[PDB]
Amino acid sequence: EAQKQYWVCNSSDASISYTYCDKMQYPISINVNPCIELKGSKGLLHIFYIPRRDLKQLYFNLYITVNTMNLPKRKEVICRGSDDDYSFCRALKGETVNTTISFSFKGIKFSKGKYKCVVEAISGSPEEMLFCLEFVILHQPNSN
Template sequence: MFPFMLFSTLFSSTFTEPGEKRWVCNSSDTSVWYSYCDNLKFPISVNAEPCITLKGGRGKLYLYYIPRRDIKSLYFNIYVSFKSVNFPVRKEVICRGSDDDYSFCRALKGGLPTASCGKCDNRLGTGSSSLAN
């Protein structure tokens, strides 16, 4: 009994579930949401311009945030609905800790991340995406 309590106490904060879904945008054929694992009400703001479409298109994805710790790994859970049909959650890995495409992946705690990407084509289902702070 004691080893179970110790294990669950030590690792309860490690295995976090995604929080509430946040709406990003609606297009004629798609609705997009995201979620994050953080106890702040709005630590990350996401905006797509224009909204992501399944027909193919070009657009930009904007992220607004101030990191509360050094960014070593970062991923998003993306929820997509097409004509009232919900697709499985897609986990999009943005920062892996090494050989990352985005310059903000090495941002330090409290800094204002800047973003540039050399391999941004076909990210998140759009023809060309970029991230900006």
């Protein structure tokens, strides 16, 4: 069984897919509306997920790669303290997450080639990996 590839969406300037990295865990459904443009766009992220850890204190380690050039790690805490928190933050092992989240993507200019972002989802203190996803964002070869 060859490793399965997941497509999220194509925009006018990007083609977005991902695969599961590290240990294969519970699956995740990820949808983006409208599809992100590398040159910048905003929209809504829909997530359908049955988690195997509690989403409490969820953060991402982001490893971004720009045409094979690795950038230094980034951290972005998602679930922080008390409220101003997404409702899914209070989700527990086994409780369906079925939410939509707003996003704004500023965008890169002069974009070309291929980008990668590996998303290490860590949550549930005691802190263990929730999921790992490696996104591949192709720049459409026929668009700037």
